[PDB]
Amino acid sequence: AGKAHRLSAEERDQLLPNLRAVGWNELEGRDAIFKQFHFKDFNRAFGFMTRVALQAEKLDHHPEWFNVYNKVHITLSTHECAGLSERDINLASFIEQVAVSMT
Amino acid sequence: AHRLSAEERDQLLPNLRAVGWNELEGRDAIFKQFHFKDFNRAFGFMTRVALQAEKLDHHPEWFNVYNKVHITLSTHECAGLSERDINLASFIEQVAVSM
C-alpha cells in the first residue's frame, strides 16, 4: 500500500473509541496512544511481551514499551507518518487480545 | 541483598564504566543504551537477559524502541546498587558482546 498514512479524523472517530473503552489514551503533545499494563510477575509480563513481539514481527510494526518487573507501559505510533495509522490500531487490538487471555 | 559500599563500588563499577555503563546523576543506578541490527535481534537479546533475570530474581528497568534497548539497573529493596545489579550487568555484557 506504499507507506502508512496518518489516520483521518473519520478513521480516528471510528477506530479509537473501542481502544479508549479499554484504557488506551492519546498522549499530549504527540499523536500516539498509550496504556499501562500490570501482571502477576515479571514472568507473566515477559510472556505477554513475547507474544506481542511475535505479532509485531508479522506486522512489521513495533511498540515503544517500558518494562519494570510486572508492569509494561506501551506507546504506539507510526514513525513513517509521525502519527497514528492502521498499524497502531491493528497492533493495539492484538495486544488487547493477549492481555485479556491471561487473567 | 545489600547496597554496595564505597569500597565495592570502587572495585566493581570500573569494568562496567569501561564498556559504557554510567551512573545516573541524581539516583543510585547504572544505565546504558544498546543498539542492534533489528527488533528481532533486540528481542532475542532481551529474552536471554530475561531468563538470567529470572535466575537472579533481579530485573532490569528497560525501554525498547525497535532495535534500541535502554537499560537501567538498581535494587529497590536496598535503595541503590547491589551485587545483583553488577551481576546482571556483567551477564548483559556477555550477551551483548555475543551479538
Binding site: 510477575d41 515479571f42 514472568n43 507473566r44 515477559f46 510472556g47 513475547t50 507474544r51 511475535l54 505479532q55 | 529474552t47 530475561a50 531468563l51 529470572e54 535466575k55
Partner: peptide, 27 residues
C-alpha cells in the same frame, strides 16, 4: 522448566507454531 521458560514455550506455540515443526527445527 522455570516459570518463565514455560511462558516462552507457550507463547512460542500460540504464535501458530505446531509442536511438530518445533521439535523438528529443534535437535
Amino acid at each position: 522448566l522455570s516459570q518463565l521458560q514455560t511462558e516462552l514455550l507457550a507463547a512460542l506455540l500460540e504464535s501458530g507454531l505446531s509442536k511438530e515443526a518445533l521439535i523438528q527445527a529443534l535437535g
